[PDB]
Tab-separated table of C-alpha atoms and ligand atoms in Angstrom:
chain	number	residue	atom	x	y	z
A	1	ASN	CA	19.884	-22.744	5.009
A	2	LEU	CA	21.915	-19.479	4.910
A	3	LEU	CA	20.059	-18.446	8.103
A	4	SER	CA	20.748	-21.557	10.170
A	5	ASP	CA	21.990	-20.053	13.420
A	6	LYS	CA	20.738	-16.585	12.651
A	7	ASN	CA	17.782	-14.288	13.032
A	8	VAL	CA	15.973	-11.871	10.718
A	9	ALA	CA	14.438	-8.546	11.879
A	10	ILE	CA	11.659	-7.333	9.627
A	11	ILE	CA	10.948	-3.698	10.144
A	12	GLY	CA	7.236	-2.915	9.706
A	13	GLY	CA	4.174	-5.185	9.866
A	14	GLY	CA	2.378	-3.931	6.787
A	15	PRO	CA	0.951	-6.473	4.325
A	16	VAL	CA	4.452	-6.840	2.885
A	17	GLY	CA	6.382	-7.216	6.129
A	18	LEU	CA	3.885	-9.758	7.459
A	19	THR	CA	3.911	-11.795	4.288
A	20	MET	CA	7.675	-11.843	4.399
A	21	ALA	CA	7.622	-13.060	8.048
A	22	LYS	CA	5.183	-15.796	7.118
A	23	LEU	CA	7.282	-17.064	4.129
A	24	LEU	CA	10.446	-17.123	6.277
A	25	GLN	CA	8.774	-18.668	9.278
A	26	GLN	CA	7.404	-21.624	7.271
A	27	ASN	CA	10.987	-22.557	6.364
A	28	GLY	CA	12.066	-22.604	10.042
A	29	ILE	CA	13.812	-19.266	9.929
A	30	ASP	CA	13.879	-17.267	13.128
A	31	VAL	CA	12.266	-13.885	12.326
A	32	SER	CA	10.706	-11.082	14.360
A	33	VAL	CA	8.567	-8.329	12.966
A	34	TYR	CA	8.948	-4.918	14.661
A	35	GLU	CA	5.878	-2.801	14.233
A	36	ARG	CA	5.255	0.799	15.165
A	37	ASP	CA	1.514	0.327	15.764
A	38	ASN	CA	0.569	0.041	19.389
A	39	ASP	CA	-1.304	-3.272	19.163
A	40	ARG	CA	-2.891	-5.532	16.561
A	41	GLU	CA	-6.260	-3.738	16.684
A	42	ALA	CA	-4.976	-0.257	15.537
A	43	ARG	CA	-7.205	0.826	12.583
A	44	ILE	CA	-5.392	0.939	9.226
A	45	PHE	CA	-6.478	4.005	7.359
A	46	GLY	CA	-7.010	3.613	3.589
A	47	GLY	CA	-9.062	1.780	0.996
A	48	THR	CA	-9.197	-1.902	0.161
A	49	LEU	CA	-6.369	-3.851	-1.471
A	50	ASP	CA	-6.653	-6.271	-4.315
A	51	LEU	CA	-4.321	-9.210	-4.934
A	52	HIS	CA	-3.528	-10.176	-8.487
A	53	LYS	CA	-3.127	-13.615	-10.046
A	54	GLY	CA	0.545	-14.195	-10.833
A	55	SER	CA	1.763	-11.811	-8.120
A	56	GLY	CA	0.040	-11.068	-4.823
A	57	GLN	CA	-2.085	-14.198	-4.961
A	58	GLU	CA	1.090	-16.264	-5.623
A	59	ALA	CA	2.535	-14.971	-2.395
A	60	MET	CA	-0.708	-15.846	-0.474
A	61	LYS	CA	-0.824	-19.274	-2.222
A	62	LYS	CA	2.814	-19.935	-1.051
A	63	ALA	CA	1.786	-18.840	2.468
A	64	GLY	CA	-1.203	-21.293	2.439
A	65	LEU	CA	-3.495	-18.139	2.795
A	66	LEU	CA	-5.102	-17.762	-0.646
A	67	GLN	CA	-8.464	-19.329	0.252
A	68	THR	CA	-8.510	-17.185	3.375
A	69	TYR	CA	-7.929	-14.089	1.197
A	70	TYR	CA	-10.798	-15.293	-0.989
A	71	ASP	CA	-13.181	-15.857	1.960
A	72	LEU	CA	-12.734	-12.336	3.278
A	73	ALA	CA	-12.374	-10.410	0.041
A	74	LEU	CA	-15.198	-9.052	-2.059
A	75	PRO	CA	-15.233	-8.890	-5.909
A	76	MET	CA	-16.526	-5.533	-7.019
A	77	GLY	CA	-17.993	-4.085	-10.156
A	78	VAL	CA	-16.825	-0.653	-11.349
A	79	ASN	CA	-19.040	2.203	-12.461
A	80	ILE	CA	-17.588	5.029	-14.465
A	81	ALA	CA	-19.587	8.270	-14.091
A	82	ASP	CA	-19.398	11.880	-15.160
A	83	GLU	CA	-19.538	14.938	-12.915
A	84	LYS	CA	-23.307	15.081	-13.587
A	85	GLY	CA	-23.813	11.632	-12.157
A	86	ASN	CA	-24.618	9.966	-15.434
A	87	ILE	CA	-23.356	6.354	-15.383
A	88	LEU	CA	-21.175	6.161	-18.472
A	89	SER	CA	-20.271	2.540	-18.021
A	90	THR	CA	-21.017	-0.284	-15.622
A	91	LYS	CA	-18.718	-3.336	-15.484
A	92	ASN	CA	-19.993	-6.106	-13.194
A	93	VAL	CA	-17.894	-8.993	-11.954
A	94	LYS	CA	-18.645	-12.076	-14.071
A	95	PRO	CA	-18.773	-15.368	-12.088
A	96	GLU	CA	-15.605	-16.524	-13.923
A	97	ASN	CA	-13.613	-13.435	-12.810
A	98	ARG	CA	-14.707	-13.362	-9.145
A	99	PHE	CA	-11.244	-14.599	-8.100
A	100	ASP	CA	-9.156	-12.333	-10.318
A	101	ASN	CA	-8.661	-9.525	-7.752
A	102	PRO	CA	-11.403	-9.304	-5.064
A	103	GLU	CA	-11.095	-6.263	-2.762
A	104	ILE	CA	-9.897	-6.861	0.811
A	105	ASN	CA	-9.998	-4.548	3.771
A	106	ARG	CA	-6.511	-3.780	5.169
A	107	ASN	CA	-7.313	-4.794	8.696
A	108	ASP	CA	-8.867	-8.026	7.349
A	109	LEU	CA	-5.672	-8.694	5.362
A	110	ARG	CA	-3.467	-7.896	8.426
A	111	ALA	CA	-5.553	-10.185	10.592
A	112	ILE	CA	-5.126	-13.082	8.074
A	113	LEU	CA	-1.393	-12.593	8.031
A	114	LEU	CA	-1.015	-12.159	11.804
A	115	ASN	CA	-3.027	-15.265	12.531
A	116	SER	CA	-0.709	-17.357	10.191
A	117	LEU	CA	2.362	-16.526	12.260
A	118	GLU	CA	3.587	-18.139	15.474
A	119	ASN	CA	2.719	-16.262	18.662
A	120	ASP	CA	5.014	-13.304	19.366
A	121	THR	CA	6.543	-13.140	15.914
A	122	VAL	CA	5.336	-9.514	15.800
A	123	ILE	CA	6.551	-7.132	18.488
A	124	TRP	CA	4.182	-4.207	18.765
A	125	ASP	CA	4.855	-0.664	19.825
A	126	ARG	CA	8.338	-0.808	18.325
A	127	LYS	CA	9.210	2.226	16.293
A	128	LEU	CA	12.636	1.632	14.694
A	129	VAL	CA	14.495	4.985	14.908
A	130	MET	CA	18.070	3.867	14.171
A	131	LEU	CA	20.167	1.023	12.814
A	132	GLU	CA	23.806	0.413	13.529
A	133	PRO	CA	26.105	-2.323	12.115
A	134	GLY	CA	28.191	-4.188	14.655
A	135	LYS	CA	30.722	-6.927	14.046
A	136	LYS	CA	28.280	-9.708	13.061
A	137	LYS	CA	24.931	-8.275	14.144
A	138	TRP	CA	22.900	-5.168	13.521
A	139	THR	CA	21.900	-3.267	16.560
A	140	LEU	CA	18.361	-1.888	16.277
A	141	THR	CA	17.107	1.060	18.293
A	142	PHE	CA	13.425	1.370	19.132
A	143	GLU	CA	11.902	4.523	20.560
A	144	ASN	CA	11.643	4.179	24.322
A	145	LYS	CA	12.087	0.337	24.163
A	146	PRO	CA	14.887	-2.158	24.558
A	147	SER	CA	17.373	-2.507	21.713
A	148	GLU	CA	17.524	-5.725	19.728
A	149	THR	CA	20.039	-7.356	17.392
A	150	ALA	CA	19.695	-9.286	14.127
A	151	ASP	CA	21.949	-10.885	11.452
A	152	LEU	CA	19.700	-9.611	8.652
A	153	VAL	CA	17.448	-6.543	8.566
A	154	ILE	CA	14.643	-6.338	6.091
A	155	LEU	CA	13.126	-2.901	5.820
A	156	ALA	CA	9.327	-3.308	5.172
A	157	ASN	CA	8.403	-0.092	6.865
A	158	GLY	CA	6.678	1.822	4.046
A	159	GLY	CA	7.466	4.494	1.504
A	160	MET	CA	8.579	7.180	4.066
A	161	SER	CA	11.106	4.861	5.689
A	162	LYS	CA	13.819	7.033	7.336
A	163	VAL	CA	16.252	4.223	7.857
A	164	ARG	CA	17.280	3.432	4.239
A	165	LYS	CA	20.768	5.021	4.127
A	166	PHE	CA	22.722	1.705	4.549
A	167	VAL	CA	21.015	0.429	1.327
A	168	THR	CA	20.793	3.593	-0.770
A	169	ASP	CA	20.956	7.406	-0.751
A	170	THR	CA	17.952	7.724	-3.137
A	171	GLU	CA	15.179	9.910	-1.659
A	172	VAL	CA	11.473	9.890	-2.049
A	173	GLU	CA	10.221	12.473	-4.644
A	174	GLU	CA	6.851	14.186	-5.144
A	175	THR	CA	5.447	13.339	-8.521
A	176	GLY	CA	3.157	16.416	-8.858
A	177	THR	CA	-0.305	14.999	-7.976
A	178	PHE	CA	-2.121	15.262	-4.684
A	179	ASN	CA	-4.676	12.888	-2.945
A	180	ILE	CA	-7.389	13.602	-0.413
A	181	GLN	CA	-8.826	10.455	1.109
A	182	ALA	CA	-11.686	9.935	3.562
A	183	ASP	CA	-14.197	7.521	5.019
A	184	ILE	CA	-17.929	7.910	5.444
A	185	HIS	CA	-19.670	5.571	7.876
A	186	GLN	CA	-23.247	4.507	7.183
A	187	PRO	CA	-22.990	5.855	3.656
A	188	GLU	CA	-26.500	4.633	2.857
A	189	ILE	CA	-27.646	7.222	5.445
A	190	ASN	CA	-24.922	9.862	5.135
A	191	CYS	CA	-24.395	10.106	1.390
A	192	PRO	CA	-27.557	8.342	0.072
A	193	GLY	CA	-27.468	9.875	-3.431
A	194	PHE	CA	-23.795	9.022	-3.927
A	195	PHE	CA	-24.160	5.555	-2.296
A	196	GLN	CA	-26.984	4.820	-4.801
A	197	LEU	CA	-24.882	6.088	-7.656
A	198	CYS	CA	-22.166	3.471	-6.769
A	199	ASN	CA	-24.990	0.875	-6.437
A	200	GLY	CA	-22.584	-1.748	-4.853
A	201	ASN	CA	-19.874	-0.964	-7.408
A	202	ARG	CA	-16.673	0.978	-7.086
A	203	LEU	CA	-17.076	4.334	-8.819
A	204	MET	CA	-14.682	6.608	-10.713
A	205	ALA	CA	-15.385	10.006	-12.186
A	206	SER	CA	-13.114	12.495	-13.940
A	207	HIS	CA	-13.713	16.155	-14.721
A	208	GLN	CA	-11.475	19.049	-15.536
A	209	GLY	CA	-8.350	17.763	-13.876
A	210	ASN	CA	-10.244	16.406	-10.797
A	211	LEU	CA	-10.513	12.629	-10.298
A	212	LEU	CA	-12.873	11.036	-7.801
A	213	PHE	CA	-12.695	7.371	-6.762
A	214	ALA	CA	-14.862	5.484	-4.329
A	215	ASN	CA	-15.384	2.101	-2.852
A	216	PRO	CA	-18.808	2.122	-1.253
A	217	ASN	CA	-18.226	-1.021	0.777
A	218	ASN	CA	-15.048	-1.297	2.757
A	219	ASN	CA	-16.481	-3.401	5.597
A	220	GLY	CA	-19.524	-1.136	5.488
A	221	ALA	CA	-17.710	2.226	5.246
A	222	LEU	CA	-17.454	4.232	2.028
A	223	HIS	CA	-13.850	5.163	1.199
A	224	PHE	CA	-13.264	7.895	-1.400
A	225	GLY	CA	-10.203	9.552	-2.891
A	226	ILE	CA	-9.999	12.834	-4.819
A	227	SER	CA	-6.853	13.334	-6.826
A	228	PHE	CA	-5.586	16.330	-8.812
A	229	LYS	CA	-2.370	18.028	-9.949
A	230	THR	CA	-0.828	19.764	-6.918
A	231	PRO	CA	-1.911	23.454	-7.173
A	232	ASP	CA	0.862	25.961	-7.907
A	233	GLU	CA	-0.186	27.998	-4.814
A	234	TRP	CA	0.933	25.056	-2.582
A	235	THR	CA	-0.007	23.972	1.977
A	236	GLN	CA	-2.772	26.723	1.547
A	237	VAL	CA	-5.253	24.151	2.843
A	238	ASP	CA	-4.831	22.849	6.400
A	239	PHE	CA	-5.802	19.118	6.715
A	240	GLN	CA	-6.431	19.446	10.464
A	241	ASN	CA	-9.179	22.016	9.635
A	242	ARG	CA	-12.117	20.332	7.880
A	243	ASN	CA	-13.472	23.808	7.023
A	244	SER	CA	-10.522	24.718	4.822
A	245	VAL	CA	-10.551	21.304	3.133
A	246	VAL	CA	-14.317	21.592	2.510
A	247	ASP	CA	-13.858	25.157	1.155
A	248	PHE	CA	-11.192	24.054	-1.281
A	249	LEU	CA	-13.079	20.924	-2.412
A	250	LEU	CA	-16.436	22.698	-2.850
A	251	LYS	CA	-14.700	25.252	-5.109
A	252	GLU	CA	-12.946	22.537	-7.123
A	253	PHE	CA	-16.186	20.515	-7.347
A	254	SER	CA	-18.582	23.510	-7.853
A	255	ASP	CA	-19.354	22.049	-11.270
A	256	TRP	CA	-20.269	18.553	-9.960
A	257	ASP	CA	-23.674	17.134	-9.229
A	258	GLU	CA	-25.010	17.710	-5.677
A	259	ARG	CA	-24.496	14.017	-4.674
A	260	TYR	CA	-20.732	14.415	-5.002
A	261	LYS	CA	-20.896	17.643	-2.926
A	262	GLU	CA	-22.924	15.877	-0.236
A	263	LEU	CA	-20.022	13.515	-0.074
A	264	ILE	CA	-17.632	16.414	0.671
A	265	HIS	CA	-20.107	18.098	3.143
A	266	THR	CA	-20.750	14.986	5.129
A	267	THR	CA	-17.103	13.875	5.627
A	268	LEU	CA	-15.823	14.383	9.161
A	269	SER	CA	-12.116	14.399	8.405
A	270	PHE	CA	-9.848	14.269	5.342
A	271	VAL	CA	-6.311	12.975	4.910
A	272	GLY	CA	-4.259	14.953	2.442
A	273	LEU	CA	-1.205	13.341	0.884
A	274	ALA	CA	1.178	14.342	-1.962
A	275	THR	CA	1.736	11.449	-4.341
A	276	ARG	CA	5.269	10.161	-4.002
A	277	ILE	CA	7.679	7.756	-5.627
A	278	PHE	CA	10.872	6.113	-4.373
A	279	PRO	CA	12.404	5.794	-7.770
A	280	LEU	CA	14.384	2.686	-8.755
A	281	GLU	CA	16.652	5.048	-10.685
A	282	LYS	CA	20.184	4.082	-9.683
A	283	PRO	CA	21.579	0.756	-8.334
A	284	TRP	CA	21.617	0.374	-4.490
A	285	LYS	CA	24.947	0.440	-2.511
A	286	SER	CA	26.952	-2.610	-3.375
A	287	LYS	CA	29.123	-2.185	-0.280
A	288	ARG	CA	27.051	-2.777	2.854
A	289	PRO	CA	28.581	-3.353	6.305
A	290	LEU	CA	26.120	-6.200	7.108
A	291	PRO	CA	23.297	-7.962	5.229
A	292	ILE	CA	20.330	-5.517	4.781
A	293	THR	CA	17.673	-5.082	2.117
A	294	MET	CA	14.140	-3.483	1.538
A	295	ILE	CA	10.810	-4.772	0.221
A	296	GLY	CA	7.372	-3.292	-0.471
A	297	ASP	CA	6.925	0.494	-0.439
A	298	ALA	CA	10.299	0.928	1.338
A	299	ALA	CA	11.977	-0.418	-1.831
A	300	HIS	CA	9.833	0.998	-4.676
A	301	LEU	CA	7.002	3.274	-3.357
A	302	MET	CA	5.029	4.308	-6.414
A	303	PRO	CA	1.895	6.369	-7.312
A	304	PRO	CA	-1.379	4.505	-6.399
A	305	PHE	CA	-2.808	4.623	-9.901
A	306	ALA	CA	-2.147	1.104	-11.224
A	307	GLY	CA	-2.882	-1.342	-8.339
A	308	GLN	CA	0.785	-2.398	-8.493
A	309	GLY	CA	1.590	-1.168	-4.957
A	310	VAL	CA	0.849	-4.173	-2.743
A	311	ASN	CA	1.275	-6.771	-5.507
A	312	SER	CA	4.886	-5.994	-6.405
A	313	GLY	CA	5.559	-5.794	-2.626
A	314	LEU	CA	4.153	-9.282	-2.217
A	315	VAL	CA	6.280	-10.539	-5.020
A	316	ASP	CA	9.386	-9.102	-3.292
A	317	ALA	CA	8.495	-11.103	-0.277
A	318	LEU	CA	8.059	-14.252	-2.290
A	319	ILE	CA	11.372	-13.793	-4.237
A	320	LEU	CA	13.400	-12.840	-1.182
A	321	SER	CA	12.107	-15.651	1.033
A	322	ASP	CA	12.636	-18.217	-1.752
A	323	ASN	CA	16.200	-16.980	-2.144
A	324	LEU	CA	16.784	-16.975	1.653
A	325	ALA	CA	15.353	-20.517	2.106
A	326	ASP	CA	17.465	-22.294	-0.523
A	327	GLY	CA	21.116	-23.266	-0.177
A	328	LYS	CA	21.019	-22.010	-3.785
A	329	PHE	CA	23.479	-19.135	-2.918
A	330	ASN	CA	26.785	-18.958	-1.050
A	331	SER	CA	25.850	-16.104	1.247
A	332	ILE	CA	22.945	-14.030	2.515
A	333	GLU	CA	24.578	-11.148	0.567
A	334	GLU	CA	24.211	-13.096	-2.673
A	335	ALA	CA	20.672	-14.185	-1.866
A	336	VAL	CA	19.723	-10.491	-1.180
A	337	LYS	CA	21.606	-9.314	-4.314
A	338	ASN	CA	19.807	-11.711	-6.604
A	339	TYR	CA	16.438	-10.689	-5.150
A	340	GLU	CA	17.322	-7.005	-5.606
A	341	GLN	CA	18.262	-7.570	-9.271
A	342	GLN	CA	14.923	-9.191	-10.063
A	343	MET	CA	12.978	-6.531	-8.141
A	344	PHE	CA	14.649	-3.756	-10.081
A	345	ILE	CA	13.190	-5.131	-13.278
A	346	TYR	CA	9.561	-5.757	-12.344
A	347	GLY	CA	9.619	-2.957	-9.766
A	348	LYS	CA	10.708	-0.508	-12.475
A	349	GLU	CA	8.029	-1.873	-14.830
A	350	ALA	CA	5.399	-1.313	-12.135
A	351	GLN	CA	6.703	2.194	-11.439
A	352	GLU	CA	6.529	3.115	-15.112
A	353	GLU	CA	2.984	1.859	-15.407
A	354	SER	CA	1.978	3.890	-12.266
A	355	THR	CA	3.734	7.039	-13.534
A	356	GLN	CA	2.302	6.670	-17.017
A	357	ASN	CA	-1.205	6.143	-15.668
A	358	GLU	CA	-0.814	9.123	-13.367
A	359	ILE	CA	0.210	11.329	-16.387
A	360	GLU	CA	-2.519	9.847	-18.616
A	361	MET	CA	-5.238	10.488	-16.060
A	362	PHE	CA	-4.385	14.135	-15.468
A	363	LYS	CA	-4.211	15.230	-19.107
A	364	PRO	CA	-7.013	17.594	-20.424
A	365	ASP	CA	-9.199	14.861	-21.993
A	366	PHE	CA	-9.007	11.801	-19.857
A	367	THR	CA	-11.694	9.077	-20.299
A	368	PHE	CA	-11.214	5.973	-18.042
B	401	FAD	C1	-3.694	6.826	-0.802
B	401	FAD	C2	-3.077	5.487	-1.193
B	401	FAD	C3	-3.860	4.519	-1.835
B	401	FAD	C4	-3.309	3.299	-2.233
B	401	FAD	N1	-4.089	2.358	-2.879
B	401	FAD	C5	-3.478	1.158	-3.239
B	401	FAD	C6	-4.221	0.192	-3.902
B	401	FAD	O1	-5.417	0.425	-4.150
B	401	FAD	N2	-3.601	-0.996	-4.262
B	401	FAD	C7	-2.278	-1.213	-3.965
B	401	FAD	O2	-1.738	-2.235	-4.286
B	401	FAD	N3	-1.520	-0.275	-3.316
B	401	FAD	C8	-2.116	0.904	-2.968
B	401	FAD	N4	-1.357	1.833	-2.305
B	401	FAD	C9	-0.030	1.401	-1.730
B	401	FAD	C10	-0.298	0.264	-0.736
B	401	FAD	O3	-1.212	0.690	0.241
B	401	FAD	C11	1.004	-0.242	-0.139
B	401	FAD	O4	1.807	-0.641	-1.257
B	401	FAD	C12	0.760	-1.437	0.780
B	401	FAD	O5	0.123	-1.128	2.017
B	401	FAD	C13	2.024	-2.237	0.960
B	401	FAD	O6	3.015	-1.594	1.586
B	401	FAD	P1	4.077	-2.060	2.610
B	401	FAD	O7	3.720	-3.268	3.493
B	401	FAD	O8	5.388	-2.238	1.843
B	401	FAD	O9	4.142	-0.743	3.447
B	401	FAD	P2	2.974	-0.159	4.440
B	401	FAD	O10	1.622	-0.674	4.101
B	401	FAD	O11	3.084	1.322	4.398
B	401	FAD	O12	3.445	-0.652	5.882
B	401	FAD	C14	4.608	-0.261	6.545
B	401	FAD	C15	4.382	-0.736	7.963
B	401	FAD	O13	5.505	-0.358	8.685
B	401	FAD	C16	5.119	0.271	9.861
B	401	FAD	N5	6.181	1.246	10.154
B	401	FAD	C17	6.376	2.502	9.592
B	401	FAD	N6	7.427	3.047	10.208
B	401	FAD	C18	7.925	2.146	11.096
B	401	FAD	C19	9.028	2.148	11.952
B	401	FAD	N7	9.915	3.170	11.909
B	401	FAD	N8	9.256	1.037	12.756
B	401	FAD	C20	8.435	-0.051	12.750
B	401	FAD	N9	7.366	-0.046	11.905
B	401	FAD	C21	7.132	1.026	11.087
B	401	FAD	C22	3.851	0.995	9.534
B	401	FAD	O14	3.114	1.167	10.712
B	401	FAD	C23	3.187	0.000	8.620
B	401	FAD	O15	2.484	-0.931	9.420
B	401	FAD	C24	-1.959	3.033	-1.939
B	401	FAD	C25	-1.209	3.992	-1.300
B	401	FAD	C26	-1.746	5.198	-0.922
B	401	FAD	C27	-0.837	6.171	-0.229
B	402	MIY	C1	-12.638	-27.023	-9.315
B	402	MIY	N1	-13.327	-26.950	-8.041
B	402	MIY	C2	-14.466	-27.849	-7.943
B	402	MIY	C3	-13.743	-25.637	-7.755
B	402	MIY	C4	-14.992	-25.197	-8.194
B	402	MIY	C5	-15.415	-23.908	-7.927
B	402	MIY	C6	-14.579	-23.068	-7.209
B	402	MIY	O1	-14.989	-21.830	-6.969
B	402	MIY	C7	-13.339	-23.498	-6.742
B	402	MIY	C8	-12.909	-24.795	-7.010
B	402	MIY	C9	-11.540	-25.299	-6.555
B	402	MIY	C10	-10.919	-24.563	-5.360
B	402	MIY	C11	-9.386	-24.775	-5.247
B	402	MIY	C12	-9.092	-24.193	-3.842
B	402	MIY	C13	-7.749	-24.733	-3.293
B	402	MIY	N2	-7.468	-25.003	-1.841
B	402	MIY	C14	-8.268	-26.216	-1.533
B	402	MIY	C15	-7.737	-23.923	-0.850
B	402	MIY	C16	-6.664	-23.782	-3.757
B	402	MIY	O2	-5.611	-23.693	-2.948
B	402	MIY	C17	-6.803	-22.996	-4.883
B	402	MIY	C18	-5.673	-22.560	-5.731
B	402	MIY	N3	-5.783	-21.790	-6.830
B	402	MIY	O3	-4.555	-22.944	-5.439
B	402	MIY	C19	-8.080	-22.331	-5.075
B	402	MIY	O4	-8.259	-21.565	-6.026
B	402	MIY	C20	-9.136	-22.635	-4.023
B	402	MIY	O5	-8.859	-21.842	-2.849
B	402	MIY	C21	-10.443	-22.185	-4.649
B	402	MIY	O6	-10.753	-20.884	-4.612
B	402	MIY	C22	-11.254	-23.065	-5.297
B	402	MIY	C23	-12.462	-22.553	-5.936
B	402	MIY	O7	-12.756	-21.317	-5.815
B	403	MIY	C1	-8.231	4.130	-13.235
B	403	MIY	N1	-6.860	3.972	-12.788
B	403	MIY	C2	-5.973	4.258	-13.915
B	403	MIY	C3	-6.624	2.679	-12.224
B	403	MIY	C4	-6.154	1.579	-12.998
B	403	MIY	C5	-5.922	0.322	-12.393
B	403	MIY	C6	-6.133	0.183	-11.007
B	403	MIY	O1	-5.922	-0.986	-10.414
B	403	MIY	C7	-6.598	1.275	-10.232
B	403	MIY	C8	-6.841	2.521	-10.837
B	403	MIY	C9	-7.302	3.715	-10.002
B	403	MIY	C10	-6.825	3.696	-8.536
B	403	MIY	C11	-7.731	4.603	-7.710
B	403	MIY	C12	-7.073	4.676	-6.388
B	403	MIY	C13	-7.582	5.884	-5.622
B	403	MIY	N2	-6.556	6.732	-4.915
B	403	MIY	C14	-5.661	7.236	-6.007
B	403	MIY	C15	-5.799	5.977	-3.876
B	403	MIY	C16	-8.649	5.585	-4.584
B	403	MIY	O2	-8.864	6.567	-3.723
B	403	MIY	C17	-9.471	4.492	-4.603
B	403	MIY	C18	-10.738	4.307	-3.815
B	403	MIY	N3	-11.561	3.281	-4.002
B	403	MIY	O3	-11.123	5.123	-2.945
B	403	MIY	C19	-9.009	3.398	-5.401
B	403	MIY	O4	-9.819	2.616	-5.888
B	403	MIY	C20	-7.532	3.341	-5.716
B	403	MIY	O5	-6.827	3.052	-4.538
B	403	MIY	C21	-7.287	2.169	-6.627
B	403	MIY	O6	-7.414	0.956	-6.088
B	403	MIY	C22	-6.977	2.324	-7.926
B	403	MIY	C23	-6.791	1.135	-8.729
B	403	MIY	O7	-6.893	0.010	-8.179
């Protein structure tokens, strides 16, 4: 055990950081997770996640959590519709595929992971602001909270991580598309037409450079996403002002059936976010003052257009913890290096599929 008298600090308790903690902890490795969120009941904004066979489900299997993911997750059909609300295609989940990639709510998934860990593995209300290599141990600075030390830092703190410099100088880039996401509670009441259009399935529609995506049943809330090429004029919409978002969306969707509009009218608040990528373009720094690495979105943030986001992040966790558990390597540095080499290959494959899908979707005639 390379980590025998040592401790690991995982930065970020997202699905990836928590899975990592779990895989380490079951091999007797001393690990803490430092998480920005105030407490375990903070709501996680966003849609559902789905775990794939051969990747995310493998990580959950190794964690002893796969059945638990199954119990909480929900297989979903997919309806493809036009802007007029015609159903162009309906694909239901066949009994035999119910386990392929059922949708799970992000708080549900967090709860499964947190529960699997020993008490006080996760330290809440810990926003890592700075890292500093000492002689043997990293010193870790948390906003308005005591400092901590660790022999190995694993950054799992998401695609906007600000603390990556000791691993790489690569920066996040905007890919050119933009996403507006929102929730509607009691959608059966609040967007009845649209809710009926989804009819228990996820829904996707495409028209004139505007893509709309919806999951009508994220623990009872409807989550939708509207994606388009970032307008040249952008910024000119303020996401704190629902009126300017509504104005923009109604103009973009003026062509769409009234049920889609009702969706935009009824939404209380929208989150706007530019699609981004942390490109696995150049190798990471091969000289590092102490052992440090990155997994999940911190390592390979990619556009959310291929479902590869969480799954490749779960694989990282699986590959890194395997490496770190086995006296298969001479040093933590070697265990990390070997993990990073593998991740560059499947990571880069996932990024290319995300990028390619993103391009393919936003061309003049896209048809799902
Ligand atoms: C709009 C959108 C839709 C998406 N849809 C999908 C999808 O359908 N399927 C899919 O696979 N992927 C999707 N993705 C990506 C997916 O959500 C992430 O890949 C997934 O959550 C795994 O990421 P992670 O654990 O590596 O990082 P995150 O989920 O981002 O978690 C990072 C964690 O670190 C914490 N943190 C951040 N800063 C600090 C700090 N300084 N100190 C301590 N903690 C910190 C955060 O609070 C968070 O808990 C989507 C992304 C976006 C933006
Ligand atoms: C073959 N066996 C009778 C059946 C029949 C119908 C089923 O729907 C299922 C099984 C086996 C079990 C294996 C169990 C196992 N475990 C007891 C939790 C298990 O770990 C697996 C697995 N793939 O490792 C499952 O798929 C599993 O979670 C599962 O989803 C099953 C399952 O869905
Ligand atoms: C159609 N498109 C190419 C694909 C292909 C494979 C996929 O696995 C997926 C998509 C679309 C994207 C839509 C994105 C959307 N957005 C870009 C984040 C989105 O808002 C939703 C949603 N339900 O609200 C998704 O389903 C979504 O997260 C998702 O899970 C997708 C997804 O899983």
